[PDB]
């Protein structure tokens with residue numbers, strides 16, 4: 001199977017009763033000839049307002065923002081490379097999605113968000129690291145919202161830069177202590193760039209930063225402060241640690257992050 | 270039982286450390302380790318003393334000392350079965366006659382007719398179902414009909430688990446003689462997960478042992494289906510393989526003892542059946558074939574087994590280093606990437622020395638040809654190995670008959686011993702017949718009467734006094 | 738967790754047929770303690786299914802440890 005964005009090519013775009021054009025694996029990349037490509041032009045109704053981009057109907061000359069550069073409050077520049085622009089509209093760098101317009105994303109091009117992951121070891125009753133057949137066990141702190149039916153990483157939209165730690169964790173972690181954890185959020189990076197999503201059009205896609213904060217010792221240290229920063233539920237259902245596995249019940253694309261995360265430490269899968 | 274309870278600490282010794290020298294590399298969550306780090310800041314059960322010097326680089330036999338042993342007794346698994354399993358703790362170096370005396374006299378075991386020593390991969394693995402069923406049924410069948418000891422590692426992982434499941438299948442059947450299938454397991458005292466509950470001096474006669482799979486470190490748990498346990502001790506917690514120098518000595522001491530029933534007397538034969546394996550399994554196969562012990566290697570489901578199963582048919586000079594490395598890469602495929610190029614010359618040299626002894630090795634060839642059963646294959650391999658021995662005169666064809674009458678089964682002696690190429694006089698058939706007359710074996714009497722012994726010439730006066 | 742290998746057993750005991758649970762659920766790769774086999778056994782005891790009782794008795798549940806006071810009130 002060729003590594004394509006099959007979750008974006010997925011039919012029946014979420015929360016909008018529209019269908020997209022059938023794009024098979026030969027048809028996906030922009031280089032190959034595909035003449036009958038007729039992607040419908042569709043944007044969400046709430047994409048003509050404020051903060052979010054007014055380029056939903058960008059046949060008008062309202063499309064005047066700077067492309068692959070930080071155009072003011074929206075740092076519209078890709079982590080992957082300089083994206084090609086046609087008729088004042090960006091194209092998806094990975095291939096055809098079969099759906100034109102803005103969709104449900106904020107702005108054109110990439111939409112920069114953040115997903116941080118906290119990893120720790122799994123100790124037994126004595127306090128030594130538990131093991132599968134060759135590798136070891138990892139535990140990660142994940143959160144379930146009451147209206148998602150899917151456990152997810154604690155990462156939100158990076159509309160602010162350094163407050164996106166707090167914006168992901170305003171209902172979850174804290175207010176004052178959240179800035180203290182944002183000070184400690186400078187860790188090690190794993191993967192940055194394009195990420196698969198069902199809310200991806202030909203013009204709007206999601207690029208992300210994957211930082212990995214880790215706890216080595218499982219005794220008394222920073223973790224007691226992370227457990228002491230628990231003001232867990234303001235508008236969320238539950239939040240807890242969870243042991244890693246391939247059959248980990250999570251959001252669909254986020255497992256693709258963890259398959260890149262467990263390679264950085266040597267866990268099992 | 271009280272006489273056993275007196276006898277065991279007077280005769281058996283154990284090792285323990287007395288000197289605390291702290292280690293450079295701190296262990297995972299047990300950072301204080303005094304070069305063994307058993308359970309204290311100091312790897313000792315003695316007074317904290319300067320000992321007139323601080324000897325760095327503590328020499329193992331010069332540091333540790335022997336003492337009476339406390340861990341002996343009987344054990345039960347908490348909630349898995351209701352039978353009892355005997356177990357004992359021994360030192361690293363004991364005379365094997367002491368262990369044999371403990372096994373035969375006080376534990377209550379008769380002398381075995383056959384000694385099967387199964388070895389395989391300690392890492393867990395999976396196998397084809399039909400070959401699994403054939404392997405279980407054949408091993409259970411031969412160890413039942415012979416009355417043979419099965420000696421293995423006493424761990425829950427790997428091939429020892431499969432032997433345990435075969436024994437558990439026979440105990441699920443449980444038709445007759447449940448005490449026929451005895452299996453001993455020899456394991457290191459250090460790598461036992463819940464060993465602290467076992468330690469109780471002067472007899473821990475009911476000892477409840479809990480187990481939790483996957484809730485353990487590098488050290489592992491005991492298997493449950495084994496019947497007897499011998500736990501060798503060096504006094505070192507973080508180590509593997511202390512049982513390997515003791516297992517070969519114990520098996521080689523058993524393999525000279527003579528079990529004599531009736532008129533005939535034999536020496537106990539030893540065979541090893543090997544599975545998937547590793548480097549230590551290949552070293553064990555080479556060490557066995559140097560001494561003369563026959564080996565049976567099962568084709569399929571193995572790394573080291575299916576190396577030998579393929580390379581066995583080709584001649585010795587045709588085996589080359591590149592061929593060995595190429596077949597190593599297709600079978601290992603991860604360790605082969607981690608393997609160096611300096612070990613593969615050692616491996617092809619060992620494989621050439623192993624296949625050079627064409628007689629002592631036998632490959633299973635499951636399904637294809639000669640695959641009647643595992644039991645007849647093991648018996649045929651053992652009888653071929655006894656046939657290949659050097660002999661003056663025709664004592665070998667007599668010795669195979671005494672072996673086949675010592676085992677109860679008659680189809681083996683019919684199939685190959687009486688088939689061809691001995692040209693024996695019936696008078697020489699006389700002394701085994703007496704044994705077949707004494708031990709109530711009518712089938713062997715029928716076979717010898719068919720093969721030509723005359724009962725009028727056989728029964729004389731002195732043999733009538735001997736039979737009465 | 739290991740709720741899936743429990744759920745397949747509850748499904749296979751909900752259907753009357755026993756060869757399916759013998760063929761694949763108990764064949765390999767669960768490593769279960771017998772205590773966790775306890776609550777389905779009660780159901781197999783109630784609905785008059787002796788074959789599942791024979792299978793669980795073969796697979797290792799101890800009847801002395803299983804029958805306690807509160808489960809005796811529940812069975813009555």
Ligand SMILES: Nc1c2nc(Br)n3c2nc[n+]1[C@@H]1O[C@H](COP(=O)(O)OP(=O)(O)OC[C@H]2O[C@@H]3[C@H](O)[C@@H]2O)[C@@H](O)[C@H]1O
Nearest residue numbers: 388389390391392422424489509510546547548549550551
């Ligand atoms: N009894 C054990 C044993 N128990 C454990 Br937990 N290990 C063991 N290694 C060797 N043996 C004995 O040695 C024989 C040959 O073992 P092999 O060469 O096939 O082992 P590999 O698969 O290469 O290593 C498996 C891992 O488990 C560890 C090892 O230290 C190693 O880290 C076995 O039949 C057995 O009798």
